[PDB]
Structure formats: C-alpha cells, structure tokens
Design a protein around this nucleic acid. Structure first.
Ligand SMILES: [Mg+2]
Ligand SMILES: [Mg+2]
Ligand SMILES: [Mg+2]
Ligand SMILES: [Mg+2]
Ligand SMILES: [Mg+2]
Ligand SMILES: [Mg+2]
Ligand SMILES: [Mg+2]
Ligand SMILES: [Mg+2]
Ligand SMILES: [Mg+2]
Ligand SMILES: [Mg+2]
Ligand SMILES: [Mg+2]
Ligand SMILES: [Mg+2]
Ligand SMILES: [Mg+2]
Ligand SMILES: [Mg+2]
Ligand SMILES: [Mg+2]
Ligand SMILES: [Mg+2]
Ligand SMILES: [Zn+2]
Lengths: 99, 83, 155, 60, 116, 127
RNA sequence: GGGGACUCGUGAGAGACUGCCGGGGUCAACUCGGAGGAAGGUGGGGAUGACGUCAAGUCAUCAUGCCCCUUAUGUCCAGGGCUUCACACAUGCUACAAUGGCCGGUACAAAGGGCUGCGAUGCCGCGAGGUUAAGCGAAUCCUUAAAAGCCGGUCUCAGUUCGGAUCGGGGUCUGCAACUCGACCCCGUGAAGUCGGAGUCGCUAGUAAUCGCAGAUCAGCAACGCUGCGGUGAAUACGUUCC
C-alpha cells in the first residue's frame, strides 16, 4: 500500500534537507510514489546559566538547542525499493526512523 | 509511616529489643538512636535512652505520649536566653 | 527630554457619546488596565447625571470642566537663599488634564458608596460651582494671584 | 570536589533515594543539568568550544 | 435571638449569623441550614421561634460549640505541656510550634518589638 | 471568486471571507454583539466601513483565533480593510489616510535577565 | 472521503537605501516637511564589553606555585546541626476592601514538558487524592479548565461575608524515614492591619500597573525566588534653572 513512514531529525539546519532532497532522490529512481519533504515545527530547549563561577547572579547566558524535523513521506513499500531505502549512508548528524 | 494505609512506623531493630523484654517482663533501658520511631502501646512503662545529638536522654512512656514520635522528648537545640 | 518635545497620542472618539472628552475621562479613571471597568463607571455616572437634570450629560460635563480649569498655576523656583512661586499661564490642553484629574481625584475620597454615585455627584456639583474640585480652582487662583510681584521671572 | 565523594556518587548507595548527581567533568554537587550531566560551568565552556552538538548561543 | 447562648447579631442574613457561634464557620453554616430547611437568604430578625427550635437541637446532636469546644481546645494545649514533648516546651515560651521561622518573624506568637 | 484576506494584530490571526450581502457579522459562528460585547471594540470593527460608506453591504464571516479579544478586534479591522481593496481599487487612498492598512507592530517586549519585567528594575538601595 | 483556496508550519528569496520630491547648507556632510509603502530615517528588541581601572570577586567549579597534615587536617557510618532568636537591616509576597468580597453562568492565549514517564475515560471520596486503563517518545496523545474579562445574584461601609497570621483536630501523597524540619487537603480558630514618620525606588509605549500559564534544579519540597510566556492596557514630558 502506502506504509513506509520516515522520520528524519537533525540538530542543524542545511544538513537535513539536503539529506531529504538529494539522498531520498534515490527512491523515485526505483519507481516509487513520493509525497515530498513536509516541514514540521522546530523544537527548542533553552538553558540559562550564570556566567561567573561565584556570586554574580545578574550576569547570565542563554544557550538553546534546536531540532529540525522533515520528510514524513508515505512511499510505496515495494520489496525492490525497501532494500535500496536503507543502503545509503546518511550523515552522522541525521537521525532516521522507519516506522 | 504517616499515612494510615501503610500503618505506623517503628524501626525493626527497636521492636526486637522490647519483645525480648515483653516476653520475660523486665524494664531495662534501651539505648537507641531511632528518633524517627512512633511510640506504640507496647512501649508503655518501658524507658528509653534516646540520642539527641550529643548524649542519650531518658524518656518514660506513660500512656498519653502514645501517638508521638520518640524524638520529641529529647530536645536537640539549646537556648537559655540572650541575656 | 534634552532633545525637545515628544509626540502626544491621539484619542479615538467615544462610541456611546460622540466626544473625545469622554474618552479622556475614562483614561483618568482607568486603574490596572481595567478599561471596560473604567468605561462602565464613566458611562454609568453620565447616565445618572441625566437622571437628575434631564439635560444631555456631556453638556453638563463641559459645564463641569469650565468651572475647574485653572488659568494660573503656581510653579516653584529658587533664586538665592530663598524660594518662591512664580505664577505662569496654563496652556489649554494642560488645563483640560489638570481639571480632569481633580474631578476623578476629589471624587475617589467622596462620601457615597459606589464610584458611580461618587463621580456623578462631583460632576453635578462642579457644573454648579459647589464641589471640592471647584474649591481647588480658586485655591490655585488665590495662591497665584497673591504672587503677582514674582511674575517677571518666567524662564 | 573531594575524590571520595565523586566515587561514592558513582556507586550504588543504600536507600536508593540517597542517590544524587554530580558533574561528569569536575564532580560538582550543585547546578547539574540532567540532559547533559554537566554543571553550569562545564556546560558553558563546552558549548563555546562546539564540543556538544546542537547547542549554541540563543538570541531572540 | 439567642441560639446556644450566643446572641446573634440582629438584622443580618442567616448564612453569616450562624458563623458568630464559636465552632461554626461557613461550611457548617451551609449544613445547619440544609438539614433544617431554613433558607440562606433570610434575615435573623424575620426568624421564627418554631424555626429556632429546629436548629437549637441539631447542634448538640452533631456539633461542638462554646464552652465544651473551648475547653477541649485548651485541654489539648494543656496535654502537650505536662508530657514534655517538643510542642509543649514550645507552647510554654510563646514561640511558634509548627516548625516556623523564628529569626526574622513570628511576631504573632511573640508580641511587638522589644527593641533591645 | 472568493475574497480571501488576513489581518493580524498581536497574536490574533483572523481570516476574513468578505461576501456581498445585507450586512451581517457571524464571527466564528457567533454574531458581533454575541462575540464582542463591548461598544468600543464594535466601533473599530466597522470603522473601515463607515469611511467607505458600505456598512449596509458585505456580510462577512471570519475565523477568529489566537491572542486575546482586544487583539482579535484589531486584527479583524486589518482584515476588513485589506478585503475592501479586493472589491474596490478606488477606496485605497481613503483607508490609507485614516491608517487602516498599517499592521501596527507593537509586540510584548521580552523579559530581560536581571530585571523584574521587560523594563522594570528592582529596588536600587545604594547602601 | 477529499481539497491546495485561506491560515499555519519552514525552506529559499523580495523589501528601507536619505532611494524619490520640496525648502534650508560651501554646491558638502547633514537637517526640516512630504509622496509611496507592512515599515522612514538606527522600524522594535536581542547577541556583541576597545585600551584599562578597582592588589574588586573566586585556592570551595576546575587548574596551579609555595606552605602545612599523614594512627589524621585522610576516610566510612549513625544521630544532630546548617531551619536557633532579647533584636537590627535588606529583597519580596498577601493585605488594609465596594474600580471590592462571595455564589451561579459563559468567552478569548502564548511559549514550554512527557518512558524510573504524561494518565484521558470510568469509578470511590466534601477535598488533597485513590483505583482502573485508553492513547502517546508526540504539530497526532496527555499536560490543558488560562486568569483578569463579560452577564446575573447577594453583601451595604462594618475591623465586616475585608484580612487569613497563629493555634486545636482530622487526613492524603512522596520517601527506608516527614520529631527536630516537607508540601497539600478538610473542619474549627479569626491576630496585626483602616494606606504607612524622616526617608527612598522603578518606569517615556505595547512601557508602567495588573492577570494568569510554563520551564530548569527536583523522589518530594520552604517556588512568594529565578529564567521565560502571553492577556488587558494607561498618565505624562513646558523644559534645562536646580539634584
Ligand atoms: Mg535528591
Ligand atoms: Mg508582561
Ligand atoms: Mg544589591
Ligand atoms: Mg555593534
Ligand atoms: Mg583583595
Ligand atoms: Mg575575600
Ligand atoms: Mg589545596
Ligand atoms: Mg551523616
Ligand atoms: Mg543558610
Ligand atoms: Mg474572605
Ligand atoms: Mg466566576
Ligand atoms: Mg465525585
Ligand atoms: Mg459583578
Ligand atoms: Mg487594631
Ligand atoms: Mg473600610
Ligand atoms: Mg519539581
Ligand atoms: Zn563541572
């Protein structure tokens, strides 16, 4: 049917959409039905630390941690494709789920 | 332990020290550090040397201190007055 | 400021009573951002003003302000080892401000129960020249007209 | 901190509520975040150094 | 209108007039007036003596009011003092008993500032 | 073809679907006096309509969402004035002169560290 | 089911430069006023701290030179303390009420958290909670009912239906354990306080004032703190003499 659901996550911008575009281009050449990379909202994890190691409360930093999500593609689970879905080496800063 | 679903709380090393004396009916003092233990109505008449931080303080369980913790009768701090 | 005057904000016409004087009264009554509360007090007191005269209430309001607008204020100035007050001329849109503050202020400490019947009784007593808001008008005038000798140092 | 207290917090204590956290770089008992395992100080050098991914300075 | 020897404040609504009894606040006042059927929006000057019998006897069967509440309260404070507990010593000195901060506050148990 | 505009004020985002008619408001399934019960807000809902004098036409309906109610009233005013241009290319200088096309960017300023609020500082106390 | 219109999510870009007009200025820098534009002269806010000062702070984050301890100034454990209380200061919270209290009804957010978890629904309890268990590593499910606001009712200016300290009793949950010393709930109790002396603080706009919500640390929590988020939303600025 249309069963394969991929769930790319990554810390940085521009290392994930290129992993969605030019790397999951290797699915349409096996003749499958793509729906395109769908952007999801970005997660944020804000941290707030005191700068000084002692007694200066009013001087602070703000560190964040973004997480980008994309490519909720619902391609055709053809047994020829599902081999070649997982042959490519994704970068180290890209996570993937096959659900 | 403070909620009626799980009973009261007495330390098990303190329950064994009175059950060896409730079986033969003697009233020797029990040196103890268990301030957190509840007084139950099997401590009646028993005396207890209860640690307060620096020494052990005698306490005589009479009848009306039977819903209290055992540490409530050895005061830890000391204050006579500023002048 | 050091760098000259600042632009002042336009007040939109009031929908119930088509006048910018009503919407300049609700901003004096406004406390803690309760603007729909502040408009129920002003609208409620103006409806009680026509229940005791029959006259249109904003005509009574403009007669009430014309009895409490000051013309001479009494600003302070030190010269040497002594101070004094200089009588200076109140520009007109300050006299609107300084008179709306006296009506709201002297009726918050007035002897009724609710703010609607406190504010409405002060408007009616000022449109006849009776209230405590009218009393500060001539106290501001008698103070400034007792110091005509110092009107020669006007910055 | 003291080197005995760093080894004690690593092991398994009696009465499992008695456990706590220390910084995995310097062994500090306070201000340790759970996402990183680091205190407020060691988080701040390692984020500037780019040594833990996804973390940078935020402005909004 | 004496209820239990308490002299209710005249010209006052019945939800609040029962709260002048030592031992009844607003929750008991809703459930005296619910069992006896006397409505809450009633003044105390319009009360009926036939109605006053209905709630002068519901209270002794269920509640605890002046005198024998006030003596049961002051015999609990009395109990802690001779057993020598922590709160009994803490009752003897006018210091606060429920684990309170005594460095910058507790001006309720203590009086006004002695100012040495 | 349907008029599709959008106005937004602070966080409110309305979606005006201006249709010609007898003049009727049903904002989010609810009329004007049933959704905005305040006469000051209702003055500025149809304040672009009294300028162009087309208030007796144009029964609208919108999808009111986000923000608070005063933000929703001002966002609806920007939605109407940007919808009157798609039915009329000649009332544009009339509504630009009043200021009904300005989006009015006035957001809540962020809280800054060391401060009690966006700008409020704590007690100074030099000694 | 489906649609690609509208929002939104997020990629890539367009846009503001004194670019255009008029007056002033050495024709210059630039300034005053327009037009057009979502925005106009740094559009709003953040990030960003030159050379140095204060022998400023930190040897208790870490690191380190000297110096001292090595049957103890090392290290384990149980109890206690860090929470004391004639007082003095400092930063806040809740108040002294009618622009309010209480009861009933009803509307509109944003940014966040969730596997040793979030607990919908049902059921029992006045209530904190207990129990059962769906769905969810989440734009999906839960957190999640925002509170002020609006409308109706009542109180009627009183130390009160204001205030909610203190104390008496009864509980729930976390945890080996809640006495010293946890928070929350129910019933009772109902203190000071009626707007604060000399003095002193913050704030120029979505600011101040007021109203909630969330996060980190965390078993629980002394969270009224701190860092954020949105709701409603002012009054003024002549001016540069004085501080
Ligand atoms: Mg712990
Ligand atoms: Mg705010
Ligand atoms: Mg300071
Ligand atoms: Mg710069
Ligand atoms: Mg020094
Ligand atoms: Mg020093
Ligand atoms: Mg050393
Ligand atoms: Mg120890
Ligand atoms: Mg301390
Ligand atoms: Mg009350
Ligand atoms: Mg309500
Ligand atoms: Mg129930
Ligand atoms: Mg009301
Ligand atoms: Mg008094
Ligand atoms: Mg009063
Ligand atoms: Mg917590
Ligand atoms: Zn560290």
């Amino acid at each position: 049917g249309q069963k394969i659901r991929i769930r790319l996550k990554a810390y940085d911008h521009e290392a994930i959409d290129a992993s969605a575009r030019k790397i999951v281009e290797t699915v349409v050449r096996t003749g499958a039905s793509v729906v395109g990379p769908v952007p999801l909202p970005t997660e944020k994890n804000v941290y707030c630390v005191i700068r000084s190691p002692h007694k200066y409360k009013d001087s602070r930093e703000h560190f964040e941690m973004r997480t980008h999500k994309r490519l909720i593609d619902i391609i055709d689970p053809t047994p020829k494709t599902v081999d070649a879905l997982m042959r490519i080496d994704l970068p180290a800063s890209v996570d993937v789920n096959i659900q | 332990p403070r909620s009626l679903k799980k009973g009261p709380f007495v330390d098990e090393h303190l329950l064994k020290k009175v059950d060896v004396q409730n079986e033969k009916n003697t009233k020797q003092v029990i040196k103890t550090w268990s301030r957190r233990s509840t007084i139950i109505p099997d401590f009646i008449g028993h005396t207890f040397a209860v640690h307060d931080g620096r020494k052990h303080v005698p306490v005589f369980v009479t009848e009306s201190m039977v819903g209290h913790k055992l540490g409530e009768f050895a005061p830890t701090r000391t204050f006579k007055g500023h002048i | 400021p050091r760098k000259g005057p600042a632009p002042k904000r336009p007040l939109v016409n009031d929908p119930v009573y088509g006048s910018q004087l009503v919407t300049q009264l609700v901003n004096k009554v406004l406390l803690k951002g309760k603007k729909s509360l502040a408009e129920r007090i002003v609208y409620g007191a103006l409806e009680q003003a026509r229940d005791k005269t029959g006259t249109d209430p904003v005509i009574t309001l403009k007669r009430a302000l014309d009895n409490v607008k000051p013309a001479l204020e009494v600003r302070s100035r030190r010269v040497g080892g002594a101070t004094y007050q200089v009588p200076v001329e109140v520009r007109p849109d300050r006299s609107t401000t300084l008179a709306l503050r006296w009506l709201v202020g002297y009726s918050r400490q007035r002897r009724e129960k609710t703010m609607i019947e406190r504010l409405a009784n002060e408007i009616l007593d000022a449109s006849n020249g009776l209230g405590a808001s009218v009393k500060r008008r001539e106290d501001t005038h008698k103070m400034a007209e007792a110091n005509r000798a110092f009107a020669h140092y006007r910055w | 901190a003291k080197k005995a207290l760093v080894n004690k917090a690593a092991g398994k204590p009696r009465f499992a509520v008695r456990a706590y956290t220390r910084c995995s770089k310097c062994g500090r008992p306070r201000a340790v975040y759970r996402k990183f395992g680091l205190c407020r100080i060691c988080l701040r050098e390692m984020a500037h150094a780019g040594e833990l991914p996804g973390v940078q300075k935020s402005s909004w | 209108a004496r209820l239990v020897g308490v002299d209710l404040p005249r010209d006052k609504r019945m939800e609040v007039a029962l709260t002048y009894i030592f031992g009844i606040g607003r929750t008991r006042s809703n459930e005296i007036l619910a069992a006896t059927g006397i409505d809450r929006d009633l003044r105390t000057r319009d009360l009926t003596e036939e109605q006053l019998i209905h709630l002068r006897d519901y209270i002794e069967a269920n509640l605890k009011v002046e005198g024998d509440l006030r003596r049961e309260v002051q015999a609990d404070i009395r109990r802690k003092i001779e057993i020598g507990c922590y709160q009994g010593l803490r009752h003897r000195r006018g210091m606060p008993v429920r684990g309170q901060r005594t460095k910058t506050n507790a001006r309720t148990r203590k009086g006004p500032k002695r100012t040495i | 073809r349907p008029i599709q505009t959008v106005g937004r004020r602070k966080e409110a985002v309305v979606r005006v679907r201006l249709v010609p008619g007898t003049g009727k408001f049903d904002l989010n399934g609810r009329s004007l006096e049933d959704y905005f019960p305040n006469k000051v807000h209702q003055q500025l809902i149809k304040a672009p309509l009294v300028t162009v004098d087309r208030v007796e036409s144009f029964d609208i309906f919108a999808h009111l969402g986000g923000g608070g109610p005063s933000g929703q009233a001002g966002a609806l005013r920007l939605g109407i004035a940007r919808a009157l241009i798609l039915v009329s290319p000649e009332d544009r200088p009339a509504l630009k002169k009043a200021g009904f096309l300005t989006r009015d960017p006035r957001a809540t300023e962020r809280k800054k560290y060391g401060l009690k609020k966006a700008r409020k500082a704590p007690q100074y106390s030099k000694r």
